[PDB]
Symmetry: C2
């Protein structure tokens, strides 16, 4: 068993930190990442052939969709099916943070 | 794409010979997810998920409060902002020794169900 404070993980888009908290180094099936998006930060719209499972931990996250956008806040979860267009933007003055998990096929 | 408030998922009371004072939400389940499941557990004050093991891993992120982790031997406390990886078939359990509810995310691969 591994027990650790997330922020202590060294990080691996604009104005992002990406931490792989539980990577395939340790885990057999899926990966736990922590994303910190600075004010004005951006993860461009993209597509990958694997799903995302996300939990918004802090702040107000703009979710970029195939068409248009939606804003969610801390305490929201997000499921993105494989190949669905998605991106993320921080349109606030405050740090945004979210947990993001992907299956092994997505690497880290 | 699904975007929803976690708390809006109806929590189910979990009550077994080895679990007391616990509620569980399945946030992203096998209805939607092809590979692994996102749960949110709420442990009331004094609540207990006693030591057990399963042939699948857990990936945990603590959302709220101080979580006492029962390890193969002894215990260790973590808090909001900690993650936990539990290997398959490793003994583990959880206890809430505080006076307020503790919450954590807990993800398992599909072979573990929901
Ligand atoms: Os993506
Ligand atoms: Os378990």
């Amino acid at each position: 068993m591994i027990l650790k404070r997330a922020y202590d993980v060294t990080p691996q888009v604009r104005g992002v930190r990406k931490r792989v908290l539980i990577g395939l180094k340790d885990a057999p099936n899926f990966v736990m990442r922590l994303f910190t998006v600075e004010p004005g930060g951006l993860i461009d719209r993209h597509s990958h052939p694997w799903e995302h499972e996300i939990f918004v931990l802090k702040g107000k996250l703009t979710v970029l969709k195939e068409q248009g956008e939606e804003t969610v806040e801390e305490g929201f979860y997000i499921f993105v099916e494989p190949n669905e267009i998605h991106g993320f933007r921080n349109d606030t003055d405050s740090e945004v943070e979210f947990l993001c998990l992907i299956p092994k096929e997505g690497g880290e």
